[PDB]
Each structure stands twice: as C-alpha cells, then as structure tokens.
Amino acid sequence: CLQNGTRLLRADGSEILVEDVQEGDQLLGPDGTSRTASKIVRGEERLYRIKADELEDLVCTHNHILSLYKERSYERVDITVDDFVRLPQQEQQKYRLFRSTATLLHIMSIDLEEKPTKWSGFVVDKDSLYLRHDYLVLHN
C-alpha cells in the first residue's frame, strides 16, 4: 500500500501511477518477467515516509512489507514497516533497500507523516515483488 503519486513500472517499461493501477494490470517484477495486479484497495491515513539516500522517499502504510537486505554477504529479509519502525536504530542500520539492475541502499530515516494522505494498494502474483519507477523492489 503506497502513497498516491508513486510511479511503478508496467510490464513494458513505461510508468503508471499506483492510484491508476486497476484489476489485471501488468506490472514489472524484479526478474524482468510480468506481474498481474489484483484486489485493488484505496484508503486515506497518516503514512510512513522512508528517507533513503539518493533515491526518492518511499511513502507507504504501517502494514506495508519491505523487502530488505541485512548484514552478516547480505541475507534477504521481509519485514513490515511497523516492526522496522520499532527496531532499534543500530539494528535498523544493518538493513538495506535494494533495486534490480544488485545495488544496495541505506535506510537513513523513517518517520510518520504529520497529515493523512490518500494511498492505493494491490496484491501481485508470483514472487509478489514488483518494481518502482527507479527499479526499487517493492512487496505486496
């Protein structure tokens, strides 16, 4: 469940707003093969902004699942936004967002927004992973 305005990659490569994703739309997965979106949902609530370096922030709901990498090379970890929020900061520093091109990105901040915001979400088939416009790997 992402903030409205987030741009995802379609199966061809072109962009699409997350609020415009409809039932059966073809998104792009991290392995290059296609993805089918279903069970579109909308809402409005105070979201979490994840500030990473270089890349545009990731604004999502508290129950959103992050696909991250953890140190000690790296191991693949899926963790919800709430649990990651409650993690100690020295533990949070061991996690990395990642994109498909094998680039790692440090999570530098994560905070609750001041005002509510419209958000859209869906579910994805296969490995249930899809790609943001900047090729950031996102989960259901």
Residue numbers in the entry: 1 to 72, 90 to 118, 132 to 170
Source paper text:
Inteins are internal proteins that self-excise from their host proteins and catalyse ligation of the flanking sequences (called exteins) with a natural peptide bond. The fungal intein of interest here interrupts the gene encoding pre-mRNA processing factor 8 (Prp8), which is the largest, most conserved, and highly essential protein of the spliceosome responsible for mRNA splicing. The Prp8 intein belongs to the class 1 intein family.
Crystal structures of the apo- and cisplatin-bound Prp8 inteins revealed that two degenerate cisplatin molecules bind at the intein active site. Structural and sequence analyses indicate that the Prp8 intein is most commonly located at an area on the surface of the Prp8 host protein responsible for binding of U2 snRNA, U6 snRNA, and intron RNA. This suggests that an unspliced Prp8 intein likely would interfere with the binding of these RNA elements to the spliceosome, and thus, disrupt spliceosome function. Because inteins frequently interrupt highly conserved sequences of host proteins, they often disrupt functions that are essential for the pathogen’s survival. Therefore, inteins are attractive potential drug targets.
